[PDB]
Amino acid sequence: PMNIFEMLRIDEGLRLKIYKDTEGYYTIGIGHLLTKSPSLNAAKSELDKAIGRNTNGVITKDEAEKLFNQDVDAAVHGILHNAKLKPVYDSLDAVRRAALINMVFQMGETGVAGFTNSLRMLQQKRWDEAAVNLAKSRWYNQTPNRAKRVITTFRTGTWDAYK
Amino acid sequence: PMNIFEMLRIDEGLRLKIYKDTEGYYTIGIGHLLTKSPSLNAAKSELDKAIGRNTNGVITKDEAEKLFNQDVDAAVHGILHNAKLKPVYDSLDAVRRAALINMVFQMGETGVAGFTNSLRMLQQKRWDEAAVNLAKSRWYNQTPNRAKRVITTFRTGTWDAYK
Ligand SMILES: [Cu+2]
């Protein structure tokens, strides 16, 4: 069925070969930034560290999956030790928790924490209201396809936007 | 619509009023231990500090999910800081991760960590072997129905045991 992995797989892609994101940054797997450096070798260097193997620049689904888990773990962990985020997160239902995790995964804990108002409405289950507000963000402006999916997940509490 | 929440709801129940678990400790929601004390007052008091109101020992589904989310947070967080658990955790696909969480929710991080040989089989993705091994545990012997569900989840990587 549906889960944070399938959801993020859809939003971030899944690639077994190093590629440039939309800032030209080297990335692999499911939206995993290797480095800002423009050097391809620095990128494979960081890759080999992360995977534990001389990969040249290609990995396996399994390696991409393990990588992904470590990244999600880091998003979740960041939510748990952030006192702005943990209470909204825990107030949420299972489907909407995945939405929040998505945001932290994309822009990081500190950033998602910057959404003070939306976070309130969400914790207060002001669903429609939250969706409207989030839509005005710079986040939506920069990645509207992805944002509307996340946003609509917040409104409905279903996986409708990924099915 | 299947997730860790639906999974543990089934395994542990979802109760909206305080009740005694096996061992007669006061409990609510999804196997949420309130207090070991024999006073129903003490149980209500703890309950009111957790939810944010005077409940009289009755909560809503949302509220019970809030509580469930806090217990789940604790399980994963515990896994994240456990050298014996995190690497197996990260080797697992999402469905299988919920199975591991399930186990930690039931018996505790330290307990699950005891399954040294079964975890290794899990990590190495030796599913049939892991399943065969886990069945020979005391856990299986004590709660064979729930355990077989969890075990079958590890064996297949699907939700079929809960449908
Ligand atoms: Cu921690």
Side-chain angles (χ1 to χ4, degrees), chain A residues 1-43 45-83 85-125 127-162, chain B residues 1-8 10-35 37-65 67-83 85-163:
Chain A
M2 203 64 223
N3 59 49
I4 189 58
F5 167 91
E6 290 296 338
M7 177 198 212
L8 277 165
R9 151 76 115 101
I10 290 181
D11 281 337
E12 295 273 358
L14 176 41
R15 319 208 68 192
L16 309 183
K17 277 204 180 71
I18 294 175
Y19 72 102
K20 317 244 269 174
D21 79 345
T22 63
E23 282 96 286
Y25 296 148
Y26 301 100
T27 304
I28 203 172
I30 299 197
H32 183 88
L33 180 58
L34 291 168
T35 190
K36 302 281 201 166
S37 157
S39 189
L40 199 276
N41 299 270
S45 171
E46 280 291 301
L47 184 51
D48 292 346
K49 289 178 60 188
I51 300 308
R53 171 166 76 74
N54 186 312
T55 67
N56 232 32
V58 315
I59 66 180
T60 61
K61 319 173 178 178
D62 286 324
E63 291 172 337
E65 187 166 35
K66 185 185 140 203
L67 230 211
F68 167 78
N69 284 332
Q70 302 180 342
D71 285 348
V72 163
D73 290 350
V76 175
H77 204 243
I79 287 180
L80 301 188
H81 292 286
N82 187 297
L85 299 175
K86 190 181 194 297
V88 208
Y89 185 56
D90 290 335
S91 76
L92 293 167
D93 45 285
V95 165
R96 293 176 173 102
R97 297 188 117 212
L100 191 65
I101 294 179
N102 195 297
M103 294 180 71
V104 174
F105 191 97
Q106 188 176 355
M107 74 196 42
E109 159 214 344
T110 297
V112 175
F115 290 76
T116 298
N117 297 330
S118 292
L119 288 173
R120 179 195 314 103
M121 312 166 194
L122 282 180
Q123 186 169 3
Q124 292 179 357
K125 313 201 175 299
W127 308 134
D128 269 14
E129 301 56 51
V132 177
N133 206 225
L134 283 161
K136 310 200 198 67
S137 74
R138 307 184 309 277
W139 162 60
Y140 182 100
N141 242 94
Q142 200 52 44
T143 49
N145 266 29
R146 172 178 193 160
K148 338 173 184 101
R149 288 194 289 266
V150 177
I151 287 165
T152 315
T153 303
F154 277 131
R155 173 160 23 88
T156 72
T158 72
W159 284 113
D160 272 342
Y162 297 78
Chain B
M2 195 67 51
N3 53 50
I4 193 54
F5 177 82
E6 301 296 351
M7 189 196 204
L8 291 180
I10 290 162
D11 275 347
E12 302 250 352
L14 173 56
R15 232 64 136 52
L16 270 31
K17 147 223 76 273
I18 293 172
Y19 71 96
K20 309 201 194 162
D21 70 356
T22 67
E23 302 170 20
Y25 295 158
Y26 294 109
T27 295
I28 198 167
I30 307 194
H32 183 82
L33 173 67
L34 249 16
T35 186
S37 161
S39 179
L40 182 50
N41 184 95
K44 232 161 286 205
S45 161
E46 286 293 301
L47 184 56
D48 296 1
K49 312 171 51 164
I51 308 310
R53 48 172 194 100
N54 184 326
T55 56
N56 318 268
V58 184
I59 63 172
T60 71
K61 205 236 76 266
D62 293 328
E63 285 168 351
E65 191 162 10
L67 247 27
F68 168 77
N69 291 332
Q70 305 178 339
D71 299 349
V72 173
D73 292 348
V76 320
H77 196 156
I79 292 179
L80 293 181
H81 294 315
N82 193 295
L85 297 180
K86 185 177 197 299
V88 206
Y89 191 51
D90 291 339
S91 64
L92 297 177
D93 56 278
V95 166
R96 289 188 172 93
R97 311 183 102 217
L100 189 65
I101 291 169
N102 188 307
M103 287 189 74
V104 167
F105 208 94
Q106 180 181 358
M107 60 183 73
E109 132 193 21
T110 302
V112 180
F115 293 75
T116 298
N117 290 324
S118 288
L119 299 174
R120 163 189 67 77
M121 293 169 178
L122 280 186
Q123 180 161 23
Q124 286 173 24
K125 306 197 176 301
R126 314 205 306 219
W127 314 130
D128 302 296
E129 293 176 61
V132 155
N133 204 232
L134 279 155
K136 305 177 179 182
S137 72
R138 78 310 196 288
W139 166 57
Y140 175 85
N141 193 86
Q142 293 291 311
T143 50
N145 302 309
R146 176 192 189 157
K148 199 180 292 80
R149 279 197 290 288
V150 179
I151 292 182
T152 291
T153 300
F154 283 134
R155 153 109 62 179
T156 58
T158 72
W159 291 111
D160 298 348
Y162 296 83
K163 287 148 89 191

